[PDB]
Structure 1
Amino acid sequence: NYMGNPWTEYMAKYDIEEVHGSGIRVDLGEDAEVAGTQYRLPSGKCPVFGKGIIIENSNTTFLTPVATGNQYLKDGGFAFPPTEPLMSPMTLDEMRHFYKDNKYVKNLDELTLCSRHAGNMIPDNDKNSNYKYPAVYDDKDKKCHILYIAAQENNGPRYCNKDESKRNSMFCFRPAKDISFQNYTYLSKNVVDNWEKVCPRKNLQNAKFGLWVDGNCEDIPHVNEFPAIDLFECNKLVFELSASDQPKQYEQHLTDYEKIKEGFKNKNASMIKSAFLPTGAFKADRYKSHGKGYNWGNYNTETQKCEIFNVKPTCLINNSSYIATTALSHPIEVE
């Protein structure tokens, strides 16, 4: 009779579609209005551990400031250009000093502080706009980097394929959990201040996700199995298959409507402004995953198999050959 589950509270933080509510590989869960025009943006309530963007055919890394023709590189990355005074990038001590008169903000955890700090950058001199920029925090540097470019992928292999191919291309890139992003966290404007309690972080040693069925934790019924030499590789796989908000109808020669659809705001000449807009039977929501995807994996350290699945788990099985991992989780860290 009783149909409750004593696992419910413990497992809430693996109910990713609820706590996170957006894409993970690619997060463009919300739309905000800037100066009349509507743009897509990240909106994930949880930090994405390990995630960064890989720029294809460029030396330049993604936390290098965007191209303005000044100090960092030419072609540049995704980060806010230098400013006076410099709000980005900014260290932990530097942030805590800037917000020292604000009791709530000055005591935030490093990750929520960075998202909040980023939240303070005004889009295109629009004072009352809901549009806030995402950000990446680096635990080695202790540096919050504010992202000027909120798009996370553009690489249809018609232009992008060698790594740039033809005569007049501009930016090819994709989200990844590269080994060099291990200390990075991708932070949307919405990262909650209580993430370390409601969001995944560390992978679970000697644990396997399961389903609560008739007072019992049973195996996940339907999993897909991939080879994975180590936990990192299983995490990369889960992250590759996780909730995506990418326009899964990808274009060719990018039109302005398709530019915005990828989460582009500025073609840098000014703002990207659609004259016809999305119209008809579209809803405007056909690429909002709301956190729906293959967000979880059961890594078997013995068979080297990454058992990946798209239903939320509702208990844990004790099994010494397993590590339970999520697409939000740290690529490496185990508890």
Structure 2
Amino acid sequence: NYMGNPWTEYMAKYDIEEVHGSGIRVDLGEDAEVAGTQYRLPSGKCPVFGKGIIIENSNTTFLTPVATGNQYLKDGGFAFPPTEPLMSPMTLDEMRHFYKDNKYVKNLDELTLCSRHAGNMIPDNDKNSNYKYPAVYDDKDKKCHILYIAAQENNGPRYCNKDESKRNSMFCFRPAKDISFQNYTYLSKNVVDNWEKVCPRKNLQNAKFGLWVDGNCEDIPHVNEFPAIDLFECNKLVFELSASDQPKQYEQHLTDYEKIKEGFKNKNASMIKSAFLPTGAFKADRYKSHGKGYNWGNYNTETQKCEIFNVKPTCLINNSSYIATTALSHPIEVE
């Protein structure tokens, strides 16, 4: 008796734990050695559409180069400092002209090209480091921004609560899908060259994710329903509940072992040379979600209800009052 599913090939891009493989809201799914010291870094295979980092105590945006050095304002942003020749930011055409001598690379789509490019910055003169930096591509600009800071969140309430006695300062931020991020995509070193066919992007008009049971597409058994004025608001929530590699045990006064837990590598004059190390009860990893979270949403446009779930969907129901969305998808775009 047939156990198979004619939806399987279609829904493979919605098997987010397999195709993406890392956190989405916070991606820190791999470790890499740099000059003898292991650090966390992004490693999801799929692009994250709409995603950026909000800085809390600053007016400086996250695509602004990192700090110390007269240039892009105050405590800096997250991006690579100016090189000669300028390697970040780089536009699509500048990028294509750079790698003109390379057949595979020069012809990549704008997103895998940005990821590959970002992957050419070596960390801390360790020529053989497996450690590669993430990137943000801006589709309005055609600009690829390489990220020097790979951290995505530092903001516990008792040091980071907003402009008022935080204890006052050094770096409060969180990933978000803000409206001014619509044209941005968050790219790990691992963004696959064929994400365009194995990864999610546009939302599905007139479709509801379901489960294939007994030759029929049934509703997701277990959902959590949230109000959301529009699809944008639903995607923001789905993203907010998604796979997360943040040390989802929050820290106090920032220690070195916990700075690295959050994805930091430097203090900007040296590295973060932690000389204790976790050899006890870890497996060197416990905050890798490998893509497990509330990554999917069914948005009902009639009831303005975001129905959010944590099991992979295996078929689609045709329902004209729905839009199917994922944490990875563009927050606004529909097909």
Q: For the superposition of Structure 1 and Structure 2, which TM-score range results when normalised by the shorter chain?
A: over 0.9
Distance 1:85 1:270 in 2: 24
Aligned CA RMSD, in angstroms, stands at 0.8
Unaligned ranges ≥5, structure 2: none
- Provide the residue aligned with 1:252 in structure 2: 252
Counterparts of 1:99 and 1:236 in 2: how far apart (Å)?
A: 36
What whole-Å deviation, never above 9, does each CA across 1:110-166 have from its counterpart, x for those lacking one? Answer: 000000000000000010010000000000000000000000000000001024634
Which residue in the other structure is 1:70 paired with? 70
Contact kept? 1:13, 1:200, Cα under 8 Å:
yes
Which digits, 9 at most, give the CA deviation of each residue in 1:187-217, with x for residues without a partner? Answer: 0000000000000000000000000000000
What is the aligned partner in structure 1 of residue 183 from structure 2? 183
Deviation (angstroms), 1:14:
0.1
CA distance in 2: counterparts of 1:274 and 1:326, whole angstroms: 37
Asked if structure 1 preserves the Cα contact closer than 8 Å seen for 2:32 and 2:131, the reply is: yes
Moved more, 225-234 or 63-72: 63-72
1:163 and 1:221 map into 2 onto residues whose CA distance is: 43
C-alpha distance in structure 1 between counterparts of 2:88 and 2:137, whole Å: 11
- SS of the residue 1:318 aligns to: strand
**C-alpha contact (below 8 Å) 2:298/2:306 kept by paired residues:** yes
Instruction: Confirm or deny: 8 A CA contact 1:96 1:107 kept in the other structure.
Output: yes
Q: Percent identity?
A: 100
Whether the aligned pair in 1 keeps the contact of 2:298 and 2:308 (CA below 8 Å) is yes
**Structure 2 partner of 1:126:** 126
Contact 1:204 1:325 in 2 (8 A): yes
State how far apart, in whole Å, the 1-side matches of 2:32 and 2:266 are.
14
Number of residue pairs matched by the alignment: 335
Residues 7, 314 of structure 1: 8 Å contact kept: yes
Give the conservation status (yes or no) of the 8 Å contact 1:210–1:314: yes
Contact kept? 1:294, 1:308, Cα under 8 Å: yes
The answer on whether the counterparts of 1:212 and 1:218 sit within 8 Å (CA) in structure 2 is yes
Is contact 1:56-1:164 (8 Å) kept?
Answer: no
TM-score, normalisation: structure 1: 0.99
Equivalent residues of 2:235, 2:325 under 8 A apart: yes
Unaligned runs of 5+ in 1: none
Shift of residue 258, structure 1, vs aligned partner: 0.2
Q: Distance in 1 between matches of 2:167 and 2:23?
A: 33
Q: CA deviation at 1:168?
A: 4.8
C-alpha distance in 2 between matches for 1:247 and 1:259: 10
